[PDB]
Amino acid sequence: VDTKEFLNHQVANLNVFTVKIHQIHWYMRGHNFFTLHEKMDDLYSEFGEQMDEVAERLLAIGGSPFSTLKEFLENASVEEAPYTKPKTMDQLMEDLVGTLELLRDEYQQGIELTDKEGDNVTNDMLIAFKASIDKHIWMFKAFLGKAPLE
Amino acid sequence: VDTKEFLNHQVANLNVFTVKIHQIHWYMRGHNFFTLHEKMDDLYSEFGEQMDEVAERLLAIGGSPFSTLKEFLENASVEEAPYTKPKTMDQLMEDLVGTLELLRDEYQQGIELTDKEGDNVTNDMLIAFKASIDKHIWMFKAFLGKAPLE
Amino acid sequence: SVDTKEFLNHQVANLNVFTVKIHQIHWYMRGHNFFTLHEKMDDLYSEFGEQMDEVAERLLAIGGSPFSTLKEFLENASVEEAPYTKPKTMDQLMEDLVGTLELLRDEYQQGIELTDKEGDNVTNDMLIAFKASIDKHIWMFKAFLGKAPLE
Amino acid sequence: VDTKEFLNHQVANLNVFTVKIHQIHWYMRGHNFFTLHEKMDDLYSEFGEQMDEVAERLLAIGGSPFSTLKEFLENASVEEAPYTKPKTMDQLMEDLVGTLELLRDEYQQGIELTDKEGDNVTNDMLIAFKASIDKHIWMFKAFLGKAPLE
Amino acid sequence: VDTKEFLNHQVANLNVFTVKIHQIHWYMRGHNFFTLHEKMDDLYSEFGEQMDEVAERLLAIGGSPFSTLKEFLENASVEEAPYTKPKTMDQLMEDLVGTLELLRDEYQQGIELTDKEGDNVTNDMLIAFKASIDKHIWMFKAFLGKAPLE
Amino acid sequence: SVDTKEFLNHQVANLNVFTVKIHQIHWYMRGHNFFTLHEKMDDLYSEFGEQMDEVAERLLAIGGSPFSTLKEFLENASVEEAPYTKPKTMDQLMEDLVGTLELLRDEYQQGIELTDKEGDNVTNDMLIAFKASIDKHIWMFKAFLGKAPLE
Amino acid sequence: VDTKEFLNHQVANLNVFTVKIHQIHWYMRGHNFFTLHEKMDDLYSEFGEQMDEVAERLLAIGGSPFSTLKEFLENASVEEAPYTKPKTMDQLMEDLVGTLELLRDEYQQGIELTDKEGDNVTNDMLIAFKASIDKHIWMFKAFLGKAPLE
Amino acid sequence: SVDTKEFLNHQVANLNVFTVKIHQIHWYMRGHNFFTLHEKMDDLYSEFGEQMDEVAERLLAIGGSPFSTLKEFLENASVEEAPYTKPKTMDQLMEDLVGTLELLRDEYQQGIELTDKEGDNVTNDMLIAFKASIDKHIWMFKAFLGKAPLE
Amino acid sequence: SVDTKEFLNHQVANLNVFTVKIHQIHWYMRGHNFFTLHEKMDDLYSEFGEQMDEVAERLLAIGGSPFSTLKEFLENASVEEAPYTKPKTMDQLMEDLVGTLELLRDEYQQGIELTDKEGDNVTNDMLIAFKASIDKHIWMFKAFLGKAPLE
Amino acid sequence: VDTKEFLNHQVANLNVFTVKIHQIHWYMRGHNFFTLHEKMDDLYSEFGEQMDEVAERLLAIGGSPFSTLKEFLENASVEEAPYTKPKTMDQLMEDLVGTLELLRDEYQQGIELTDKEGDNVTNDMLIAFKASIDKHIWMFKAFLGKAPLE
Amino acid sequence: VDTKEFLNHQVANLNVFTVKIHQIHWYMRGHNFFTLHEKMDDLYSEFGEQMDEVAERLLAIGGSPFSTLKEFLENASVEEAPYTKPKTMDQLMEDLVGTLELLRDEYQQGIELTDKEGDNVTNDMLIAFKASIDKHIWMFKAFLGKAPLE
Amino acid sequence: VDTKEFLNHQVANLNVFTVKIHQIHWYMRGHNFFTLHEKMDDLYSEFGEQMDEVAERLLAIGGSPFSTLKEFLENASVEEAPYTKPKTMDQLMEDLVGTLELLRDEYQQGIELTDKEGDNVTNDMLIAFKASIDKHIWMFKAFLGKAPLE
Ligand SMILES: [Fe+3]
Ligand SMILES: [Fe+3]
Ligand SMILES: [Fe+3]
Ligand SMILES: [Fe+3]
Ligand SMILES: [Fe+3]
Ligand SMILES: [Fe+3]
Ligand SMILES: [Fe+3]
Ligand SMILES: [Fe+3]
Ligand SMILES: [Fe+3]
Ligand SMILES: [Fe+3]
Ligand SMILES: [Fe+3]
C-alpha cells in the first residue's frame, strides 16, 4: 500500500525465512552436508542482517515493525512447513530457492513502490538486497544443475 | 519427559526470546537508548548461539528440533506480546529480566534432569548457559536498582 | 551541472560547520550520559568529516571547485553555529544536533531531486547513501530524547 | 541493444583494460615509478573485480558471458596495442586516462539503458562503478596537471 | 581401571586415531574431496589437542604418558590397517565414524570412572571432549545420510 | 546458601593476596631464568586476577557481597604473605608460588565438594575449571624445580 | 621523602585504588550500570599498569617496592571503606573522583620533588600519568555535572 | 638468455589464457559441487595470476619484454581455449582444468631443464616452485575425478 | 593559569584553520607527485585534527573553555587562510604548508616557555611532543622542496 | 632406492620423530622447562608439517604413503625408547639433536638421489627442509654449549 | 660539545652497539640461548629505532648525521672487540650491560646539556630513551643475579 | 675463497650496504622524497634480514661471522663514502643501483661456488636473495628511466 506496509511485510517474511534457513541447516543430510551446512550459516547471518536493516529503516520512516512470532505468522507470504518426511538435499535447496524467488519478486514490487513514492533511501536499500538475492538464485540454481531463471 | 523434550522446549523458548530481544532493541527510548540498543545486539547473538547449540545437541542425541514459528509458538513457555502501546525502558527491561529468570529456572530443571538421566554433555552445556544467565540477571537487575535475587 | 555543483559546494560549507558543532557538543557536554554521548560524538565527527571529503571530491570530479576556507564556509553555510556561552543540558545539546541533522536531511533531499533531474546518477546515489545514515541518526537521537523520529 | 548485450560488451572491455593496466605496470619508467607501479596493482584488482561482478550480474539475469580471449578481442571497444616504442609516464597515463573516459562514457550509456529497461540492480551496480572511474579520472588528470574534464 | 590407566589408554588411542585421520586425508578420492580433505586437517588439529591435553592431565595427576609408537600399538583399542585396496569416500567416513563412536563410548566409561573416583577435573575434561565427538558423529552420519545413532 | 557464599568470599580474599604475591615474585626475582619467569608472572597475574573477578561476580550473582578492601582481604585470607626482606633465590620464590597454588587447589577442592552437596552447579563447574588450570601450573612449576607434580 | 619513598608511597596508593575500582565495579547500581561497569574495567587496567610502571621505575633506581597488602595498608594515603550502606552511582563516582584528585595532587608533589632531585625519567613518567588523571577528572566531573576543578 | 626469455614470454601468454579459462569454468559450472569448486576456481585464479605477474617481472629483470596484449597471448600460447557453447558436466570442466595443468607442468619441466643448462638459477628455482604447486593441484583434482595423479 | 588557557585556546583556533588548509591543498593539488602528496595530506589531517582535540581537552581539564565555532576560530587564529583563486604549483602549495608548520613550531615554542614558567608540566610535555612531530614534518617537507630544514 | 622409497621412508621417520618430540615435551624437567616445553610445541608443528608435505609430494609423484604406526615402526631408521628412567634436559636435547642430525644426513642422501633422478620439486623441498634442520642443529647445539658440528 | 655534536656522537655509538648486539645474538651459547637469542633481536630493533630517531632529530635541528662505518668508528665511545675467545652467556651479558650503562650516563649528559641549551624536543627524546635503558639495566642485572646499580 | 669465506665476506658487505641505505634515507631531497624515504626503510629491513640469514647460515656450517665494524671495513668489497656534498636523488639511486649490481654479481659467484661444493642450502638461499636483488635492479633502473641491464 505504501513503503511502511511493504517494509513491515518483509520483516515478517525475513523472520520466517531465517527459521526456514535453520530448518535446512539442522535437518540436511547427504554428501554436500559440510559445505551447505556452513552455507546455511552464512545465509542466516546475511538475511538476519537484512531483517534488522529493514526494521530499522521502517523505524526511521515513522513505522512500527512487527515484533512477535504471532505477528510474523499472520503477515508473512513466506511459507513454512514442519519437518516430517526426510527430504533430499536438492529438495531442501529447491525450497530455499523458491523462497529466494518470492523475496526477489516481492522486493521488485517494493523497488517500484518506493521509486514512485520518492523514498530514495528505501529504494536503494531494496536494490542492494535484490542484487544479493539474484546472485544467490544463480548460485543455488547452479547447485541444482539449472539456469538462474530456468 | 526427557532430555530431548526439554531441549526441544528450549529451542522454542529461545526463538521467542530472540524476537523479544529485537522488540526491546527496536522500540526502546530514553537516555539509555544507545547503551541498551547495543547491549540488545549482544544478547541477540549470545542467545541465538545458545539456540543453535541446544538444537545441535538435540540432534546429536537423536532428536528432531522444532523448526517453524508455528511449532515455537505451540511449545514455548516464554511469552510474547505485540507492541501495540508504548512501553518505557524500565518496563522493557522488567520483561527482559523476568524472561531471563524464567529461562534460569527452566535451565535449572533441565540441569537436574540431565544429571538424573546421566547425560553429562547436555548437563555441562546447560550449566554454562545458566552461568551467563545468572550473570545477566545480576547486571540487568543492577541496572534497575535491585539486588540479583530481587 | 551548475546547480549540482552549487548544491555540493553548499554542503561542503554545511558539513564544515556541522563538524565543528559536533566537537562543541563533544567538548561541553555534562550529565549522566556523558561517557556514551562523548564517544558517540567522536563517531559522528569521523563520519560527517568523511561525508564532507567525499562531497568535496565528487565536486572536484564533476569539474567543480570546493570552498576551502573557514571564511567561505561561513559566507555560504545554512547550518547555524553559536559560541558556547551558557551551560546547556544534554537534552538541549542533542536537540541542536537533531535540528542540524534534520536540516541536512531536507537539503540532501533537495539535492537528490536536483541531481535526479540533471541526470547526475553518481551524485544522486551518493547523497542517497548519506541520507540513509542521517535518517538512521535522527531516529536514534530522537529516541534518546524520547520522541518519535518524525514528531 | 539490451542489458545482457551491454554487460557482455563490458566483460570484453574489462578484460582488455585489465591487460593494459598490466602493460603500463610492467613497462613504465620514470621518477614516479614506485607509486604508479603500485597504483596499477590497485587498478588491476579493482577492475578485475568490476569484471567479475559484471559477468556474475550477467549470469544472474540469464545471460552467458564471453569467456575467451578471442571473444574479448571480437567484442571490445577498448583498444590495445603491443608495447614497441618507449613511452613517457605521461603518455602511459594518457592511455590509461582515455580508456577510463571510454568506460565512463559507455557506463553512462549502460546506466541510461538499464534505467529504461527497469533493471535497477544493474543500474546501481554501474553507477557505483562510474563513481570510482570518475574519481580516478579526477586523480590521474591532476597527475597530468589537468582539470578532470579537460 | 583407575583414572591414570584410562587417560594413558586414551593417549595410545588418540595417536592411532590421529594417524588414521592422516590416512583418510591422504588417500581419499571422490567429488567431496576438497572439503573433506580440509575437514581432516581440522580433525587432525582437534584430536592432536585432545591428546596433548589428555597426556598433560595425566602428567598433572602424577602419571606417565605412553610416548612411543610401540607403546601406542601395545595399548590402543583403536584399530588401524595399512591402505592397500582403494576405499570409497563413504567407507573412509565409516572408519572415521566408527572410531569416533569407539572414543565416545570409552570416554563415557572414563566419565563414569572419574565420577566414582572423585576426579572432577578429568571428569569435566572428558565431558568437553565427548561433546565435540558427539557433534562430529552427528555431522559425519549426516554426510552418510543417516541419523546420528543409527 | 551461606556456605557457598562464604567459601567464595574467602577465595576473593585469597586471590587478592595471591595476586600481590605474584607481583612480589615478578619484581624481586633474580637469576638466569629472569626473562622467562618475569613474563610468566605477568601471565599468572592476568589469569588469577581474572579468576578473582569471576569468583566475585559469581558471588554477586548468587546474592552475596564480596570483600572489597585490603583490610577485608587480610582479615579473611588463608593465603600467606611476608614482606620481601632477605634475598631469595629463583627456586625459593617458585616454591612459595607452588605452595600457594597447592593451598588454592586443596581449598578449591573443598569448595567443589561444598557446591556439589549444596546443588550450585554453576559455581561447582567454575571451581573445577579453575582447579584444572591450577593443577596444570603445579605440574609445570614443579617441573621447573626438578620435581614431580605431587611430590 | 625522596624519589624512592614517593614512588613506593604510590605503589601502596595504586593498590588501594585498584581494589577501590573493583569495589565500585562490583557494587554499582542504576541506569548507567553498563557503561560505567565497563569504564571501571578500563581504569582497572590503566591504574594497574601505572602501578607496575611505578614499581619497576623504583626497582630501576635501586629501590624496593612494597609487595604485601599489609605494607600497602601501612603506607597508603588513599583510603578505603568496606561496602555496607548502599551507595548511589554519583556517590561511588564522587569517591572515584576524590581519589583521582588525591593522586593528581600527590603526583604534582612527586613531579616537583623529582625535578629538584634531577630525576628526569621519573619526572616525565609522573607527568604522563598526571595528564591522564587530569583527563579522567574532567570526564568524571562532567558525568557528575560539574566543571573539572569545581 | 634468449631461450630463457623466450620460454618466459611463452608462459606469460599461456598463463593469461589459462586465467580466463579458470574464469570460464568459474562462471559456467553447475552441479552438486558448485559451491566448493566455485571458490576453488577463485583461489586458482589468484594463484595463477600471481604466477603470471612473477613470470613477467622475472622476464623484465633479465632484460626481456613481456607480451602485454590479448592478441600477443593468443599468437603465442600453446594453451587452447574455446567459447562455452554446449553444457558440460563438472567432471568435464575439471578434466579440461587438469589437462591444462598437465600441459603447464610439462612445459615448465622443459623450462626447468633449459634454465639449468643456461645457468639462470633464479628462473630455475622460480619454475620449480611453480611446478611443486601444479603437481599438487594435479593430485587433488585427479582425486576429485576419482583418479590417481598420473593415470 | 590564564596565559596557558589563552595560549591553548589560541592553538585550538590555529589548528582548525590549518586543518581546513590541509584539505585545500589535498583537494586542489596537481602535478606528478599528486598520489603521494594527496594521501600524505590525509595523514597530516588526521594527526593535526588529533593535536587539536588533545589541546581542547587539555584546556578543558585545566578549567578552560575552548573556542568552538568557525567564527571564533577566525577571530582568534594567527594561522592565515586564503581562498583558492588562481592555480598554484605543488611546490607553492608545500611552501604554504611548511610556512604554517613553522608558525606553529614557533608559537608552540613560546607556549613551551610559558607553561614551563607557569609550572604547567602536563601542558608543557604535550606541547613538546607536538613540536617533536612538527619539527620532523618541517625537515621532510623541506626535503621535498630541495631545502635544508632551517633554511 | 628411488625417490618414492626415500620419501616414504621419511614419512616413517617424521612420525617417529614427532612422537619423540612429544616425549621430550611431556617429560622434561629443570630450569629451562618453560622455554623448551614451548620450543617442542613449535618443533612438533614444524615437523608435523614437513611430514604432511613429504607424504603429499609422494602422492603427487604417484606414490603411496605409509599410513599406520605399524608401517612407521617397520620402516623408520629413527629410533625410540619408552621413558623408564629420568633424563636431564641436556640428555633429552642430545637425543633430539641426534635425531635432527640423522634426518639432515638422510635428507642429504635424498637431495643427491633426487638430483640424479631429476626430480627438481622434491629436490627443492628437501633442501628447504634441511635449511631448517641445519638451523635447529646450530641452535640446539648452542643450548648444549657446543659448536654446530662438534 | 653542543646538541648537534652530542646527537651525532650517539649515532656513532648506537651503530657500534647495534653490531655488538648481533655479535652476542650470533655467538651466544648456554641453557638460556633460546630466550636471550630472541631478546637480542628485540634489543637490536629497539636500539636500531633509537638510532634512527637520533639521526632524524639531528637532521631536524639542521645537523648532518655520520653515515658511514668509518665515521662511526672514528667517533664512538662505545667499544667493540672481534670474537676470538669463546665467552659465557654471563660475560656477554656483562658486555651488554656495560655498554647500556655507558649509554645511560652519556644520555644523562645529553639530557643536562640539552636542558641548558633550551632544546626541549631533544631533551624529552633522550629522557624517553634513558627510561628504557634504565629498565634494561635492571632486567639484565637481574639475569646476572645483581641489583641494578651494583 | 670457499663457502664459509664467501658468506663471511657478505656479512661484511651487507653491513656496509645497510648503513649506505640509511645514508640515502637520511640525506635524500627532491620531489620523490616521501616514497623513496619509505622505500629505503623497506630495503633496510630486507637487507637487514639477508645479513642475519647469511650470518646464521654461516654459523650452521661451522663458521664464525665477522661481528665488528672494524672487521666489516677490513673485508667489504661494497664501498662507502662520507656525505660531504649534497647529491641528487638520481645520484643517490645510482649509488644504490650500483651496489645492488655488485651484490648481484658476487652472489652469482657464490651461487656457482656453492653449487660446485654441493652446499645446496646456501646455494638456494643465495638464489632467493639474488631473485629479489634482480627485481630491485629492474625497479630502480626504471625509476632512473633505464632498462634493467643497461
Ligand atoms: Fe540493529
Ligand atoms: Fe549451527
Ligand atoms: Fe567470482
Ligand atoms: Fe603440550
Ligand atoms: Fe568483571
Ligand atoms: Fe611488569
Ligand atoms: Fe606486478
Ligand atoms: Fe575528544
Ligand atoms: Fe595436508
Ligand atoms: Fe627513518
Ligand atoms: Fe637472527
What is the CATH level 1 assignment of chain A? Answer: Mainly Alpha
Number of strands of chain A: 0
The succession of helices and strands of chain A, N to C, reads: HHHHH
Beta-strand content bin of chain A: under 5%
Oligomer: homododecamer
Please give the alpha-carbon distance between the first and last residues of chain A.
31 Å
SS content category of chain A: mainly alpha
Query: CATH superfamily assignment of chain A?
Result: Ferritin, core subunit, four-helix bundle
Number of helices of chain A: 5
Basic shape of chain A = globular
Overall tally of domains of chain A? 1
The chain pair forming the largest interface, with residue counts per chain, is:
C-I, 27 and 27 residues
Largest sheet of chain A: none
What is the CATH architecture annotation of chain A? Up-down Bundle
Give the % helix of chain A: over 70%
Task: Assign the CATH topology of chain A.
Answer: Ferritin
Bound molecules: fe (iii) ion
Radius of gyration of chain A (Å): 16 Å
PDB class: metal binding protein
Keywords: iron, iron storage, metal-binding, oxidative damage, dpslm (DNA-binding protein from starved cells) from lister iron-incorporation, metal-binding protein, metal binding protein
Assembly: dodecameric
Entry title: X-ray structure of Dps from Listeria monocytogenes
